Enzyme design. Sequence first.
Site, PDB file in Angstrom:
ATOM      1  N   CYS A  91       0.898  -1.062   0.038  1.00 52.89           N
ATOM      2  CA  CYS A  91       0.246  -0.020   0.060  1.00 52.89           C
ATOM      3  C   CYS A  91       0.809   1.106   0.094  1.00 52.89           C
ATOM      4  O   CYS A  91       2.121   0.960   0.368  1.00 52.89           O
ATOM      5  CB  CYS A  91      -0.843   0.035   1.263  1.00 52.89           C
ATOM      6  N   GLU A 131      -8.602   7.717   3.144  1.00 58.33           N
ATOM      7  CA  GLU A 131      -8.243   7.775   1.832  1.00 58.33           C
ATOM      8  C   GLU A 131      -9.008   7.418   0.748  1.00 58.33           C
ATOM      9  O   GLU A 131     -10.066   6.650   1.046  1.00 58.33           O
ATOM     10  CB  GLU A 131      -7.098   6.479   1.912  1.00 58.33           C
TER      11      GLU A 131
HETATM   12 MG   LIG Z   1       3.389   0.859   2.278  1.00 57.11          MG
HETATM   13 MN   LIG Z   2      -2.645   7.502   4.317  1.00 58.91          MN
END
Ligand SMILES: [Mg+2]
Ligand SMILES: [Mn+2]
Lengths: 176, 180
Positions: free
Chosen positions: B64, B113
């Site tokens: 991520c 997010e």
């Molecule tokens: Mg990451």
């Molecule tokens: Mn973030």
Amino acid sequence: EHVILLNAQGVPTGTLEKYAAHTADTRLHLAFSSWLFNAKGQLLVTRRALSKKAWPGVWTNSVCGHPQLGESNEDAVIRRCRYELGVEITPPESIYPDFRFRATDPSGIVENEVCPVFAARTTSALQINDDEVMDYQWCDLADVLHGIDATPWAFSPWMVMQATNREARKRLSAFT
Amino acid sequence: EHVILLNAQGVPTGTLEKYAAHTADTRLHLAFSSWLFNAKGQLLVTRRALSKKAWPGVWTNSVCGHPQLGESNEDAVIRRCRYELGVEITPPESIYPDFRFRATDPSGIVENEVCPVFAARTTSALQINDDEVMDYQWCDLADVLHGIDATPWAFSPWMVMQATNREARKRLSAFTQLKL
Ligand SMILES: [Mg+2]
Ligand SMILES: [Mn+2]
Ligand SMILES: [Mg+2]
Ligand SMILES: [Mn+2]
């Protein structure tokens, strides 16, 4: 606190301060592991605090620890239940008495233990000690076993070996 | 290192340094998540390092991250794959472009997010970055999916929400095919 050092047979030969006992080269010593169920039959799974020296932040069975000199396995379990979870329990029952293992955590800390496994029921609410436990879940044993069977790596390696022993998984499957 | 802040809509309004971006009060910002598969079709699962500010020590999907100014989301994927895993990948496929996530972590840190989700194949060996990743495993997706179903609390909540989206999951399944 200390751990109890064991020779080839499980004979006590001396002790080590608990903090200093767990290293990349951990010597064989005495432990326990316990699985706690509430009156409803749910299994308590805990997540080890980020400050534990071995397997921090790892999901595992309810309570594990180290009996002191002259302390019964069952009193050790009862003590750590009080200490880690502030919980009273029924007298611990044996589920995997000859369990033994050696493993290495992601940072290289080793556990090397003779570790009889117990089960018991809680008889009071939890009062969490966040120096020991960072998270916990009450769940159905069957889901936990499915988890361990599908993705063992998401759980502590001893929880996995324990849950996968024929006899132990059979005996655990009764507390529900 | 920063995050790109998004308003109520989903349109960029500026940037914020990354650390100070993630707190108890995290503002909406751009992120990505990616799912990486080897030639064999196995899924790479990773364990966040204990020093990550949010969800440290937690098992999750491959990578991520936060795109930076002037970066495409895909280049962000390519860059973090290199940074966290040392791995080269095939062009990342969009598998869940409208994914958005807000959640509070075990110590109170919040992620907030817009997080498009990708999938790709790895084309190199791994060189894990211990500053970011403390453990990993190559697994059969099927196994992974069963674990997420059985004990979803054992995984990052975003990994569970992405794996349970129907369209995203079909895509992940497509990447399990053996491909030389
Ligand atoms: Mg990451
Ligand atoms: Mn973030
Ligand atoms: Mg303990
Ligand atoms: Mn020990």
